[PDB]
Structure formats: structure tokens, C-alpha cells
Subunit: 217 residues, 2 copies
């Protein structure tokens, strides 16, 4: 199913989000090239002002585009189960703060790749680093550690993200992930390196996000 | 726990079955030898006329008795967990027809082996091969492909059974099975089963004789 990924592919990403009861929704559009692992997407808050600063969500929004080298082609399963697709479950524990529960399905719908995801936020502290929007509009480089799951016929991944705090400190987000094939699918332990950049279209009135990302294996 | 199976062991089999709402019950009695893998059983419809022809239930009806050769003794998980026993869950998709859901518990109760099973049938078509009693009074030879369940510490098995249709056609039944201990490398079981009837029995009945071996 790599033929699906050669060249350019249109991307639609949608979110239903409930953080401590704050009901909000995000719609994403753009394209990605698996050959060069570039993602160019613009995300839109359809529910106005976001309760949470944008940074927390960037991970919960396609590992199906990551650059796998020629000698590592057989180790990418994000593409293998395509077009049928796979499910992405995550538990995200923000240290000394609240916790996210996420469930995501990644598939082809026509010629477009789609990510429809449900988000629920629980136990976040007021005027805390998250709810108080004390997170800087930025991102660092991170390594995504991937391991096989012969039990649930998929993959688990475990890592720590560094969100820069306005005051100079850093808030950590521990991640735990599970992926499962929905129809029929296909790795030794191997890893993904991500660089992500934020920007804003000055010709945009609503709350928005321009994402450009480089992901390799 | 193979000492439990050397020589003769008495067998009691009970089922609660609900097919499209049609509630029925069957009671089976007989004996089996693991050494020679023979099953001799007589099943009785306590609820009169069965909605479904007997053949569909025969698989749902003790693998424990299967003949494991001496060099394959460690690959029997049916005997291993005995006397404590194991659970058997199955989803049986009859192609172009309805589906069975089965949950079975197999244990020793005293010196007698007992299989108590809950059965639920759904979406079977009226006047279909199943509901219309269009299945013949017979059975063919099948291979039960067994694989380990390191996740649920048991066994899974997947195969296709061929039920002979009165018209000459064949009805396929796809099987998916799960076994778990309550307290092997990939290897396979070959089954031959024969149907017959006691001429001295007024109610709906089936006499089963089965030979199951390992390879």
C-alpha cells in the first residue's frame, strides 16, 4: 500500500474535544508526501476561542507519511494496512496536571486521507500550565520510539514531550500509544524523529494554526 | 493431567440454545478414550422437535479426547489444565446465512467429564438451508487447525466445515474459536464423525461416534 503514498496525498483531519467539559472542535486540511515526509496543514477552530493552547493537540492530530529508508521499507505499518486503515488509541498524562484520552481512526476516503478523532480532557488544574494558556506557541524536536505488538497485532509507542513554558520552565507530556489494524495488515524496534514548526496566516481572522512537519525514521 | 484420560471416562454434555428466539435444549451422555480418541455419545432433544437440523451443533457439541501421539504429548492443552478445566468461546459464521455464538465450559465433575454450553443464533433466514431443515443426516472429514494464544494463554483455531445440502450443494460453516484456562507449536486435529439413530427412541435423537487424532 505504499503506492498510495508515492507523491502527494490530500489530508483531512477532524477533532471532537472535551477538556474538563469544555466542548470544542477542530478541522484540519492539507497534504503530505511520504517520500519526503513533509506535512503542510492548516487547522481551524470552528468553536472560536480554544480553552487549551494549541500545542497540547499537535501530537493528537499521520504517521503514515514518515520517511522510511529503502532498507527499512518493511517496518512501516501505518502504510501496510492502507487503504483499510488502523485505529490510534493514546493515553496522555501531563505531569503534575490533567490527562487526555484519545481515540483516532486513520483511513483513505476517496483519494483523501482522513483522521477523525475523539478527545476527552480530565482533571486539569485551573491557572495551571495548560488551562491558563501558559504554553509558548512553539515546539521542539522529539523521538518517537516504536515497538511491535504481536498481542494486539499492532504497535505501541512511549515517549516524553517538552512543551516550553512562558516563564522559562518546561511542562512534560508522557505518551502511551496503541495501533490496531481494522481489516488485514502486514517491525523490529525502530524510531521516528520529528521536527515541527508553528506559524499563522496573517489573512486569518479566526483562531488558526499553520503546521509544517518533517518526520523521518 | 493425562492420567485422568487413560482408559475410559464418562461424558455428560448439556446445551442451552436460542436460534432466532427459538429456545431449545439437548442432553448428551456417553464415554470416551483419549488413548484411542473415540467418542460414543447419545444426544437427546428434551424440547421435542429441533428447529435446526442436528448437524450444525455437532461441533459445538471435548477435544480433550483427541489422540496425541507420544512425541506430541506436550502439545495438548486440553488435558493440561485438567481437572480444573478450560473455557471455549466460538463464533460460527454460516456463509450466506446466520451466525452462532457459543460459550462452553469443560471440566471434571467427580469422575465424569461435563460440557455445559450457552448457544445463541441470530439472523438465520426463514426457509433457509438451516431453518428449513435442508441439511442431510451426515458429516464429512475435517482438519482442526490449532495455534497458540500467548496473549490469552490458550488456543485459537480457524477452519471451514462442509455441511451437505439435500439438493446436492454444500453449506460452509466458518469457525473461530478461543480457549482459556480457568486456573503448543502449531499442530492439527483430524476428525471423522458418524451419525446414527437408536430405533428404540421415540424422541428426536442422534447417536454420535467420533474419531479424532493429532498430527
Amino acid at each position: 500500500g505504499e503506492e498510495l503514498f508515492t507523491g502527494v496525498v490530500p489530508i483531512l483531519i477532524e477533532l471532537d474535544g472535551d477538556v474538563n467539559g469544555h466542548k470544542f472542535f477542530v478541522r484540519g486540511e492539507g497534504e503530505g508526501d511520504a517520500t519526503i515526509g513533509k506535512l503542510s496543514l492548516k487547522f481551524i477552530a470552528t468553536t472560536g476561542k480554544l480553552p487549551v493552547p494549541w500545542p497540547t493537540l499537535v501530537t493528537t492530530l499521520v504517521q503514515a507519511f514518515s520517511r522510511y529508508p529503502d532498507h527499512m521499507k518493511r517496518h512501516d505499518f501505518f502504510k501496510s494496512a492502507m487503504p483499510e486503515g488502523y485505529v490510534q488509541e493514546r493515553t496522555i498524562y501531563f505531569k503534575d496536571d490533567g490527562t487526555y484520552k484519545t481515540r483516532a481512526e486513520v483511513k483513505f476516503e476517496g483519494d483523501t486521507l482522513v483522521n477523525r478523532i475523539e478527545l476527552k480532557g480530565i482533571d486539569f488544574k485551573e491557572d495551571g500550565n495548560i488551562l491558563g494558556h501558559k504554553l509558548e506557541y512553539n515546539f521542539n524536536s522529539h523521538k518517537v520510539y516504536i515497538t511491535a505488538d504481536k498481542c494486539n497485532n499492532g504497535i505501541k509507542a512511549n515517549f516524553t514531550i517538552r512543551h516550553n513554558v512562558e516563564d522559562g520552565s518546561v511542562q512534560l507530556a508522557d505518551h502511551y500509544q496503541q495501533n490496531t489494524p481494522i481489516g488485514d495488515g502486514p517491525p523490529d524496534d525502530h524510531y521516528l524523529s520529528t521536527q515541527t514548526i508553528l506559524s499563522k496566516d496573517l489573512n486569518e481572522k479566526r483562531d488558526h494554526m499553520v503546521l509544517l512537519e518533517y518526520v523521518t525514521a
